[PDB]
Design a protein around this ligand. Structure first.
Ligand SMILES: Nc1nc2c(ncn2[C@@H]2O[C@H](COP(=O)(O)OP(=O)(O)OP(=O)(O)O)[C@@H](O)[C@H]2O)c(=O)[nH]1
Ligand SMILES: Nc1nc2c(ncn2[C@@H]2O[C@H](COP(=O)(O)OP(=O)(O)O)[C@@H](O)[C@H]2O)c(=O)[nH]1
Lengths: 423, 422
């Protein structure tokens, strides 16, 4: 089957997914208006779409939210008639930026409908490869339903691979003051439930939008681009004849040696975004290196100083296999891997491309500097918790102080596990 | 869904609400009183019930004394659906106990029946907002009974209030402080949050910045309405942060019982529309965070912010906001250094009468001086002697009056303990 089901949870999740779906359709020559096809189909629809005999390619995804808003905007206005209505699942009240509400309160009833509807979708799949969930890490419902759903997925689908893509809050971009705690709870459960996750830091993206893209007054409408753009590239291998990680399982083999340390950084280029982006170079002598430059790091971590545990470097389009092979010669040695693993950057390419680009690429990097992301979040959390700020918004729903402590411990352990690999 | 039911109690409530709903309608494009609307913009259904070539405020009016029902029936006009006006057989003097303890029981049943109607007509309740003064026989008497009975029915629905605290402006050596403390107690016990509007503060602002020699109480209300509309507007003209009423509650109040908020706005609009200022973010912030513009008369410039947020209404450049904010953070620090405690949001819908509205809300430790003033008045009339005029038949035992004082002292002590600047 090789089928993948996406679960878009909460506002960030559904909004980014909406953009993802618009772009995947373009790649496959599908019309946003219910995904009929403009003639022949390019790419492999078997991964993300139900191939209706009627010519309707049904995106296989759920749109899940506690607030009956983003689901209606997308179902009725942005991708009207694209997503199948039975898969638009929503509650009545949102959470007030509180994980506890998203996880312990609203949603406890809804989860049976979420999982039943997921079952219905899974049931018509020939065979799943896995699930991909998208959400804000620290979102009330994002971390809330997101984590609750993940738990139930692991119980119902014990042998399928669970991936997630999620967005971290930052000092400048955040709609909540209690994030940092929603975030460690969210992270904790993911450590316990996911097989692999890609984490994007809105801090990074800002910085990129602000200085590398040249866009002042940054807004979420642009940030969501760069997120969806990276996502459509990362998941691209699953849509085409190619090599390397052509299956979620192969990704796990290559990207997560040892347990728990499965937090990957996203690297993506070019950021054409919407600028004319005329390109006098696009040369592979730059692109291959660009994917190891801070300018394209959606994690806000310098890969220069740290130890790689894994790296999968994917190129697309017109790039010469030999030129890339030669390009890596000047990367290896700036990039170092742990002495306890098989080493080297694994790379390859698929000769297809998104509209507007002859050549492009991305990388999934697992390296010890991910610890710094966690360190920032934990520091904020530790201060919040120790003096009791905002505890009541959690305690009121039953989110005990003991769960705060539990998440504190597990997330701290991740950091410790990565730090010890530095030398 | 995420809709708001507003409950308007007592004459002070009616007078503020009148100004409020007229201004809000104008901002959305809806003809106040009557005239339907024209090309309505903004998330109208949060506050209005669209009927069909008609919109009404999703609101409840409580007039214990029947003598004032015409202030809504005729003066507010046909804008507020008259079936939502609830009134009693008689009124109350300015004795909290009359409005609060076993009085108007039949009226109260009807009050809640009407609240329930506005709720059943709403897909989901994003919260409730109450508007009342704190010293009134109905205003806080019923206002407090209503606050409590609402929570009993809707324990998970936040109630936000905008309450007006009295000031004995002309030698009012009366029992009112008794009303004020008893309602303060109930606000602590049952509200999720509230804005503290102190008439004395506002008086000084009208006198000093609006240049009004002797504002009538009804003119003061214009400043109040300006604040109320611009604060409320964060939820109707969508901006850069995805806010709701429940979310505002989470972000501005880190502890139970420390939910009393200050409010400040700029530019103030002169009632006569006599002049306009250059709408510079820096200038606007300078006014908003100045002591001179604070509705609490507390001088927050000497305190510490437990939580805070700022909304800019209209088109302002990010590049100017950031410098204005840098100046503010250099002057007013935050409690426990919570790095996430200060939020800024923007939306393009400018207010009528200016290019930019700037609204600040915050939870600041100098707010205690409001409650300390109430306590002092209470003590002088209570610990010195039992001044209260035998409020015992449907009244309070000394212990109940002492309970209120005790709760108030606790809230004062807690703000003082959080901000010891160590
Ligand atoms: N990826 C992403 N992050 C966003 C977006 N908008 C805001 N954020 C960030 O996500 C953080 C978590 O809050 P949100 O993601 O808005 O939360 P939510 O998904 O709305 O969750 P609910 O409020 O429960 O519906 C915010 O504080 C911002 O830092 C967006 O469009 N995409
Ligand atoms: N700011 C403001 N305060 C008011 C207004 N009306 C009354 N008050 C205050 O409310 C108290 C009197 O209560 P009121 O609501 O008028 O009477 P009630 O309906 O019998 O409770 C006094 O402390 C007044 O200063 C008003 O329109 N604006």
């Amino acid at each position: 089957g090789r089928e993948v089901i996406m679960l878009h949870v909460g506002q960030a999740g559904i909004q980014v997914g909406a953009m993802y779906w618009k772009q995947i359709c373009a790649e496959h020559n599908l019309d946003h208006n219910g995904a009929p096809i403009g003639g022949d189909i390019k790419g492999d629809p078997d991964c993300f779409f139900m191939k209706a005999s009627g010519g309707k390619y049904v995106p296989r995804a759920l749109l899940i939210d506690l607030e009956p808003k983003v689901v209606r905007q997308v179902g009725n206005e942005q991708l009207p008639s694209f997503f199948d209505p039975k898969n638009l699942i929503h509650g009545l009240y949102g959470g007030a930026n509180s994980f506890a509400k998203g996880y312990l309160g609203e949603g406890r009833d809804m989860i049976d409908n979420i999982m039943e509807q997921l079952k219905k979708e899974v049931a018509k799949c020939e065979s799943l490869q896995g699930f991909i969930m998208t959400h804000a890490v620290g979102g009330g419902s994002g971390g809330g339903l997101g984590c609750l759903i993940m738990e139930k997925i692991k119980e119902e689908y014990p042998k399928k691979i669970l991936w997630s893509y999620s967005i971290l809050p930052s000092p400048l971009l955040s709609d909540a003051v209690v994030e940092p705690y929603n975030a460690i709870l969210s992270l904790d459960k993911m450590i316990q439930y996911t097989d692999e996750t890609v984490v994007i830091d809105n801090h990074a993206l800002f910085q990129i939008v602000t200085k590398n893209m040249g866009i002042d007054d940054p807004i979420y409408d642009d940030l969501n681009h760069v997120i969806s753009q990276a996502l459509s590239d990362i998941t691209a291998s699953l849509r085409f004849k190619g090599s390397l990680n052509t299956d979620m399982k192969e990704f796990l083999v290559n990207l997560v040696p040892y347990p728990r340390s499965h937090f990957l950084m996203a690297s993506f280029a070019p950021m054409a975004t919407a600028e004319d982006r005329q390109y006098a170079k696009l040369t592979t002598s730059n692109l291959a290196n660009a994917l190891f430059e801070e300018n394209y790091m959606m994690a806000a971590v310098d890969v220069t100083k740290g130890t790689f545990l894994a790296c999968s470097l994917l190129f697309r389009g017109e790039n010469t296999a030999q030129d890339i092979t030669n390009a890596l010669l000047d990367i290896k040695g700036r990039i170092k891997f742990s002495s306890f693993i098989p080493t080297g950057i694994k790379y390859g390419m698929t000769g297809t491309a998104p509209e507007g680009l002859e050549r492009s690429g991305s990388a999934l990097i697992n390296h010890t500097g991910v610890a710094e992301i966690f360190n920032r979040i934990l520091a904020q959390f530790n201060l919040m918790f120790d003096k009791g700020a905002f505890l009541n918004w959690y305690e009121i729903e039953g989110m005990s102080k003991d769960d705060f402590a539990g998440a504190r411990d597990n997330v701290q352990k991740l950091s410790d596990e990565y730090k010890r690999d530095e030398e | 869904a995420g809709e708001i039911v507003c409950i308007q109690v007592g004459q002070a409530g009616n007078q503020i609400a009148g100004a409020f709903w007229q201004k809000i309608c104008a901002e959305h494009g809806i003809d106040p009183v009557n005239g339907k609307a024209i090309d309505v913009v903004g998330d109208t259904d949060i506050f209005f019930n669209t009927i069909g070539d008609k919109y009404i405020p999703r609101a409840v009016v409580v007039d214990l004394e029947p003598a004032v029902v015409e202030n809504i029936r005729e003066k507010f006009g046909t804008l507020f659906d008259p079936k939502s006006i609830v009134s009693g057989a008689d009124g109350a003097g300015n004795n909290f106990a009359i409005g609060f303890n076993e009085h108007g029981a039949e009226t109260l049943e009807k009050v809640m029946q009407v609240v329930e109607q506005r709720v059943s007509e709403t897909e989901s309740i994003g919260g409730f907002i109450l508007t009342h003064s704190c010293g009134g026989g109905t205003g806080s008497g019923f206002g407090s009974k209503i606050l409590k009975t609402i929570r009993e029915r809707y324990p998970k629905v936040p109630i936000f209030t905008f309450s007006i605290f009295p000031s004995p402006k002309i030698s009012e050596t009366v029992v009112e402080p008794y009303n004020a403390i008893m309602t303060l107690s109930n606000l602590i016990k049952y509200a999720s949050c509230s804005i503290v509007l102190d008439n004395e503060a506002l008086f000084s602002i009208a006198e000093k910045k609006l240049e009004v020699e002797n504002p009538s109480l009804e003119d003061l209300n214009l400043i109040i309405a300006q604040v109320l509309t611009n604060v409320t507007a964060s939820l109707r003209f969508s901006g850069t942060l995805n806010l709701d009423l429940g979310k505002l509650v989470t972000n501005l109040v880190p502890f139970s019982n420390l939910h009393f908020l200050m409010a400040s706005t700029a530019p103030l609009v002169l009632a006569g529309k006599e002049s306009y200022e250059k709408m510079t973010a820096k200038e606007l912030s300078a006014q908003v965070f100045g002591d001179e513009y604070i509705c609490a008369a507390c001088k927050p410039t000497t305190g510490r912010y437990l939580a805070a947020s700022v909304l800019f209404r209209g088109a302002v450049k990010t590049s100017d906001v950031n410098e204005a904010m840098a100046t503010v953070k250099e002057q007013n620090s935050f409690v426990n250094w919570i790095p996430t405690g200060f939020k800024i949001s923007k939306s393009e819908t400018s207010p009528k009468d200016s290019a930019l509205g700037v609204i600040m809300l915050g939870n600041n430790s100098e707010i205690v001086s409001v409650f300390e003033r109430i306590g002092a008045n209470f003590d002088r009339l209570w610990s010195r002697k039992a001044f209260a005029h035998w409020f015992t038949d449907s009244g309070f035992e000394e212990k109940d009056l002492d309970d209120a004082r005790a709760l108030v002292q606790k809230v004062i002590d807690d703000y003082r303990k959080l901000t010891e600047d160590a």
